[model samples]
Target: SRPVFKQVLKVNSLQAQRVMERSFERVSNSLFSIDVILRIIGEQDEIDQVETVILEHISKVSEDLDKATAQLNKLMEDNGIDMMPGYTNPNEYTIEINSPQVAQFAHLIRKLDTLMGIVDTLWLNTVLTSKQRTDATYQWQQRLIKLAGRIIGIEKRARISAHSKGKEGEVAEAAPESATGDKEIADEAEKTKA
Candidate 1:
């Protein structure tokens, strides 16, 4: 039977071993984001309907990841991939795997993405709109929009430094003036800068 795909890790030298350590560190760091998200849903929120689906999905995906790691470990043992006494050959790290293992690794990638999609679905489905916006949140939005307009003006001014009195220059020059018009935005901006 044909092995569908292979993963080759070439730990050719001590330098390559150091390079491989970065590979381990990189994936380990990426997992931190997922761990934080799961913690928010799992630990922060007390077993509510809103948090349930995301939590279950994350748990299942974690199990799948564990399975894949075990599978990879066994596969390594079978091939003696680690620089052990049984396998001394170096330079090229030739690995081969079954179709099922190939599919399992592919499934792991898709499952992680599915976990993110579940979070997005829950977040977007419950997002506030129009009449749902409270006075405080709406006021926050107004201040944000004014600040956005000011930044747009500043960007244009930076882009058109010498070309003064262009509409952009006019807008940029007036950002602080407009901020003054909206005490809330000016107060917020001043607070942030300070």
Candidate 2:
């Protein structure tokens, strides 16, 4: 049997890349805006409302990241290739999955998980001063920026592999299209004759 289509992997990579880039930027902006709002609005009720919204945003983004990563691993497994061989944990982070060569996506996910825990604690405890909260969130934004850089590197690797191997796959890939083309033309000719 043939391996999984390169097109499938390419499209999956594109989707994961899009999610990573936008999620980092959106979360960063949300943190920055919350910090600014806290400085201006001193009311505890208003601050809690805003903070709740930001927390919701973070949870949604975290879910999206998990979904994309799972799809990547599943696609490989469906093709009879294990993504991280010999990994025996139900956890997300590991050396094989987080390795630089294959997919360093786990590093980003772990960072997001850490960030979510910190934010949830800060939201619940309410012990930190406004200044402390601002410092923490801003620090998180910086970490996200660093992770965003890796997305670019991953995109480059995917593109290189796609161009190198994609063309070779094309000759065999084109045969199916030729068969479909003939069927379509024959059907049209019969319809016109009728």
Candidate 3:
């Protein structure tokens, strides 16, 4: 009952720190892009805000986040532990099973022969996910569709862009749209709202 391999994505982990160092520039660059987007979309408003209207008792966003963080930390920390946690990595599983199971592993070999599948989805050389893996699939679609809405083709021009760079009417021609597509998108909006 021992799973022993050193690993970390902790804030203070050296491995994580190095990875973060590489990511800092990327994150900063994307944030600059996001800032332009937020501004163009009319920051805090298109996305909504306290909007000078109301909250139970309005607080700064940082303050709200701090309170939420404390609550999460306390709840998570006070929890005990998970029982019989999880499985091993794909590589680790193959290594463990390959020697003994090679003879009787049976159709696994045949399945491999059919050009079946490879483990195509991996993140940062790790098999990471519990809930996020499940929930993020739907989230990925919504974000992409919202992403599509950010720009559209103008005057039947051939182009693509960030909202700022895009001409007024140009949309994502990457997925071709017809009148039906527009109706479908509007209906999707309605479905999600209700």
Candidate 3: deviation at residue 2, Å?
Answer: 53
Look at candidate 3 and tell me the lDDT of residue 17: 30
**Per-residue C-alpha lDDT of model 2 across residues 32-83, encoded as one tens digit per residue:** 3334434343457755664454344444445655664465334444554432
Residue 151 displacement in candidate 2 (angstroms): 20
Best by lDDT: 2
TM-scores for all predictions? 0.22, 0.30, 0.22
Candidate whose TM-score is highest: 2
lDDT comparing candidate 2 with the true structure: 0.37
State the local distance difference test value for candidate 1. Answer: 0.34
- Candidate number that wins on lDDT, 2 or 3: 2
Residue pairs in clash, model 1? none
- For candidate 1, lDDT tens digit of each residue in 24-86? 222222222223323333434432432243234434544854564465445445644442121
Q: Each candidate: what lDDT?
A: 0.34, 0.37, 0.27
Q: Please give the lDDT score at residue 18 for candidate 3.
A: 29
| Residue 162 alpha-carbon offset, candidate 1, angstroms | 49
